[PDB]
Symmetry: C2
Subunit: 302 residues, 2 copies
């Protein structure tokens, strides 16, 4: 009867690529995928075996409902997602070829994921084993979550260099933060020129109250640091990359899930890297063969 | 108990525009609309009051189903549209700004609208009052429709200069064709430099067996020609244009509907221009397209 609550954005990623001249309806291939940091994390959690509830917002349009339906039939409990009237479901348009040419994001219904909304589900939220939130939601909403978590661990996905900032004044209310290099630099105000700077950055995070830091450094790997003193590097699982999208989402799901499973920090980080690799090796934004079994198999195969 | 059958493509048009440049997550606005020539025509027919059945193809994906649902309580009977497994629903991606920049069409699922499929609905098709087909479907499928229409008038939308050509060898099996300038030039092999050339083009169409020609000339207007001798011009309803998509779709719906209503050719053409205008004045289908509101637009001349 243990459930996980994910609070974030649910999107539709539309990817189009040609077989290219401008001012012409050029024949190509278009894919509709389910996306959104929060939604993706919820789905990866469900594929990891946890009972996951999504608290998101989608429009009164029909395509929103089919986003919810697809997600529900991925295993996610979507029956508390807010269907918002009059406004259209958010989306991530993306023009590729072979290398993305351009991308557009329409994500303002995220501001409908309000404090009043979450307050309507206060007790349900406060009786989860862990709450996962992304920084796509408004500063007020994130503030409400962190203010009303009732000692339920909040895992936060910073999303981008632009949207991580709302987290800076609230690191003492966050159980685990997973920033990349740029996001960590943006938050700390300290340059991460190289691997010699992670200690100083992490020390900045810990002095500002962050319980746990999971710092993805790209090729450098993952540097993890606990305010109680434990820290270390984990070198990347070397992989066959085909997509890069859904990497961090899978890693976040891995961290939250492993936490719920009672796993220690370091091994949870390694496992999360396993998840991220599995995501990196799959045509879609989420890998439907993400499961405890084959990430574990990817990890013992070291 | 009179129904109309529309056989064509059902798409999802996704339009995105920013507010600006490249290699970056650019904040903007994205719109999902229901589209596809056939589907649009069916919807306009339903808004005109006719009982319209759509014979189209959509993927096993969920967004296909939401296209179908949206279309259904737009008034269209979609319960015979083919849900095709394994393949994804066709779509029209379009990158704009303030002026259309680039566009992609993924429409290979149109090839699932097969002869076999339509043959599974032979009798239902053959007892409609009129069949509307677009040239997005395969040459074989259009050939099957025209070969098995059982004297039910087939109205054909040429769609584009690229796809109108499959109609060239079969103008004698078509009740009404609605080409634009470029499509007419492409079909006839005769240049339409100016308004003095419509006669020779139309004569070419009639000599190759076309019963009725409805030729949209843009600013020049609409030239209509009947193989039995009636022909004429109709000047445009002058309008407040905000988008242009769904114009020809609305006109085709107007022609088919007016035909079913027993209206004469010319008056049906004028009415159809009214419909196309109503479409031109609404951010692909106008939900206030109706006999009332078109007649009001036309009597207001
Ligand atoms: N500001 C943004 C940008 C992107 N996304 C979603 O993130 C997914 C890939 O991680 C993509 O599926 C995309 O929809 C998001 O939630 N917020
Ligand atoms: N080859 C094509 C190109 C476009 N379309 C559909 O036509 C509508 C505008 O008339 C748009 O909604 C678009 O989806 C089509 O059915 N086939």
């Amino acid at each position: 009867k243990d459930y996980v609550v994910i609070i974030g954005s649910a999107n539709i990623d539309v990817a189009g690529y040609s077989h290219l001249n401008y001012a012409d309806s050029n024949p190509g291939k278009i894919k509709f995928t389910p996306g959104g940091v929060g939604r993706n994390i919820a789905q990866n959690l469900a594929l990891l075996g946890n009972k996951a509830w999504l608290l998101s917002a989608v429009g009164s349009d029909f395509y929103g409902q089919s986003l919810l339906t697809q997600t529900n039939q991925s295993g996610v409990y979507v029956d508390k997602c807010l269907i918002v009237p009059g406004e259209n479901t958010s989306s991530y348009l993306s023009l590729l070829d072979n290398e993305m040419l351009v991308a557009i994001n329409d994500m303002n219904i995220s501001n409908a994921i309000t404090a009043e909304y979450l307050a309507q589900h206060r007790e349900f939220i406060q009786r989860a084993k862990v709450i996962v939130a992304d920084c796509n939601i408004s500063e007020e909403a994130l503030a409400w979550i962190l203010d009303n978590a009732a000692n339920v661990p909040v895992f936060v996905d910073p999303v981008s260099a632009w949207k991580c900032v709302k987290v800076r004044d609230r690191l003492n209310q966050i159980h685990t933060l997973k920033p990349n290099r740029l996001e960590a630099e943006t938050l700390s105000g300290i340059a991460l020129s190289g691997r010699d700077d992670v200690a100083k950055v992490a020390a900045w995070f810990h002095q500002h109250g962050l319980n746990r830091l999971v710092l993805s450094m790209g090729g450098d790997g993952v540097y993890y640091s606990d305010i109680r003193g434990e820290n270390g590097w984990s070198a990347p699982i070397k992989t066959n990359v085909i997509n890069v999208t859904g990497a961090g989402d899978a890693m976040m799901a891995g961290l939250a899930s492993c936490w719920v499973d009672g796993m220690p920090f370091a091994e949870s980080v390694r496992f999360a890297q396993g998840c991220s690799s599995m995501a990196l090796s799959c045509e879609y934004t989420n890998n439907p063969d993400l499961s405890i079994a084959n990430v574990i198999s990817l990890v013992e195969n070291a």
